[PDB]
Amino acid sequence: SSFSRAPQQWATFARIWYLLDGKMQPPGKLAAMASIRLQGLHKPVYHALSDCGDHVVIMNTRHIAFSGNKWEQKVYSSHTGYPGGFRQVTAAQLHLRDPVAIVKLAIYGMLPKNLHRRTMMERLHLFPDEYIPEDILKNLVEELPQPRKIPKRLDEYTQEEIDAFPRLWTPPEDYRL
């Protein structure tokens, strides 16, 4: 191993870039993983004074899938300075008018409530489409496993697996459906 003092330190205290993807996945687990990677918790030398972190890039933020009926229940409200500015926008409307805000607020609330929150948020980037700048693309390294497993529709199981699955009952031969 060896490694001189200054180079070894610069290597062990280096900033790595990661990549995350949505596409039919929940935003809670994605935001939790992003916060865990930004705060440096994933590393064995985690500490606030050390200022250890890693950039997190999320793509396809428009294809996020919520569980239950949160699309018409989660209200992302925010009061302004002037009176009567109590805005109570739902999740669907907030996503239609701004598809890069749900995961942003999730990661903002997940991260600790200290002055490092703004820095950790600035370290994070978001993109609502597959298009990513060349700089960030070249900066990306490795790809951690995805959270959800995707249910897989009927148009992907292939005919082989469909035929392998046996039937379960026998409808009448003269059933009008």
Partner 1 sequence: RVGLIALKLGMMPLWTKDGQKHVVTLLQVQDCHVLKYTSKGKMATLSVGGKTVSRFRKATSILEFYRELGLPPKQTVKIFNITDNAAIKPGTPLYAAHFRPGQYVDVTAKTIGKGFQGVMKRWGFKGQPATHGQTKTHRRPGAVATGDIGRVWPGTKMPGKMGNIYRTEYGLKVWRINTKHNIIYVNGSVPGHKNCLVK
Partner 2 sequence: FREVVETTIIEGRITATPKESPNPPNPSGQCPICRWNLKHKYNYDDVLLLSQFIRPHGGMLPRKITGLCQEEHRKIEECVKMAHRAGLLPNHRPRQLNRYLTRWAPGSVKPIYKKGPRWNRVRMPVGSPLLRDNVCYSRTPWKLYH
Partner RNA sequence: UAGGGUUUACGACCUCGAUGUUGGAUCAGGACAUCCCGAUGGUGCAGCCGCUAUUAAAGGUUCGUUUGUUCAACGAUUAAAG
Partner RNA sequence: AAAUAAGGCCUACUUCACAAAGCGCCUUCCCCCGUAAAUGAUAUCAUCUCAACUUAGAUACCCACACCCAAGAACAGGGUU
Contacting positions for partner 1 (CB under 8 A): 81-83
Question: Residue 67 binds what, of partner 1, partner 2, RNA, none (CB under 5 to 8 Å, by partner type)?
Answer: partner 2
Q: How far is the CB of 59 from partner 1 (least distance, A)?
A: 24
Nearer to partner 1, 44 or 83 (CB): 83
* Among 96, 74, 78, 95, CA closest to 87: 78
CB 18 within 8 A of CB 144: yes
Distance of CA 64 to the CA centre of its chain: 9
Residue 131 binds RNA, judged by CB under 7 A: no
Q: How far apart are CA 48 and CA 147, in angstroms?
A: 27
Question: Residue 173 binds what, of partner 1, RNA, partner 2, none (CB under 5 to 8 Å, by partner type)?
Answer: partner 2
Out of 36, 71, 104, 126, name the contact with partner 2 by CB under 8 A: 71
List of residues 6+ apart from 40 with CB closer than 8 A: 46, 47, 50, 52, 53, 54
Residue 152 binds RNA, judged by CB under 7 A: no
